């Protein structure tokens, strides 16, 4: 996260760290959607241009974390993966269209003050909140700058940007399965997700029922926090039918 702030304790209890066993490193962000399911970006797990193709035993999910590097004894919970499910129409060749994946945990995670699932939106939630100017919140342990690393979880609030403005900022083809967010050069305010924040959640707090909803997944960008550029997010509601199908089994 570039130009964000340290998260407060328990601020994002659905935040998950995807952790590579060997070498021991941060793989990606992710989110807790139930006691057994974790949501992430498909590119965190499968990305042939960079020879990325992780299997279940290559990683661990670390839930309830704040500090990036420390083993948070009696707070964080480390879970193993039973199975990874990548969207069958994930487009890694061109624009990361349908950049979404599910991970089933071997055992259910126990909820605590630091571990709690986020909601997934329904059609009405998405229609009411996914509006240009409406702000969401992005969290992660990724890069503080495009070109170090935070000590603790970072947070940034960013406005959803008009589809034409998103389209006009890039040469990449934008799909209906994506949305973009961030401030304009004329807005003064800054902020963006960056490398290592991938797979993390873009959340919004419904003013109707006061619950947090995951509207997006950190997907891609061209650099980090560049003027006239925006972060791109997987549109969670647009892919909910796939989510439900996988969970229903």
């Amino acid at each position: 996260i570039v130009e964000g702030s340290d998260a407060e304790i328990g601020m994002s209890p659905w935040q998950v760290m995807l952790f590579r066993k060997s070498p021991q490193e941060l793989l990606c962000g992710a989110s807790l959607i139930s006691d057994r399911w974790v949501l992430t970006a498909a590119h965190c797990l499968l990305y042939p241009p960079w020879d990325k193709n992780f299997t279940e035993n290559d990683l661990l999910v670390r839930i309830g974390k704040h500090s990036r590097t420390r083993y948070e004894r009696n707070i964080e919970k480390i879970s193993m993966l039973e199975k990874i499910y990548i969207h069958p129409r994930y487009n890694w060749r061109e624009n990361l269209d349908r950049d979404i994946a599910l991970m089933k945990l071997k055992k259910p995670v126990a909820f605590s003050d630091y571990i709690h699932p986020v909601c997934l939106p329904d059609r009405e939630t998405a229609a009411s909140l996914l509006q240009a100017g409406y702000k969401g919140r992005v969290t992660g342990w990724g890069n503080l700058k495009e070109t170090g690393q935070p000590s603790v979880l970072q947070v940034v609030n960013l406005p959803i940007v008009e589809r034409p403005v998103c389209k006009d900022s890039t040469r990449i083809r934008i799909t209906d399965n994506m949305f973009c967010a961030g401030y304009k050069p004329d807005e003064g305010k800054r902020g963006d997700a960056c490398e290592g924040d991938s797979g993390g959640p873009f959340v919004m707090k419904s003013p109707f029922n006061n619950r947090w909803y995951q509207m997006g997944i950190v997907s891609w960008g061209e650099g980090c926090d560049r003027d006239g550029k925006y972060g791109f997010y997987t549109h969670v509601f647009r892919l909910k039918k796939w989510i439900q199908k996988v969970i229903d089994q």
Partner: peptide, 10 residues
């Protein structure tokens, strides 16, 4: 720079 995690997590 990651602190070692307990052996029980493989």
């Amino acid at each position: 720079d990651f602190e070692e995690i307990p052996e029980e997590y493989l």
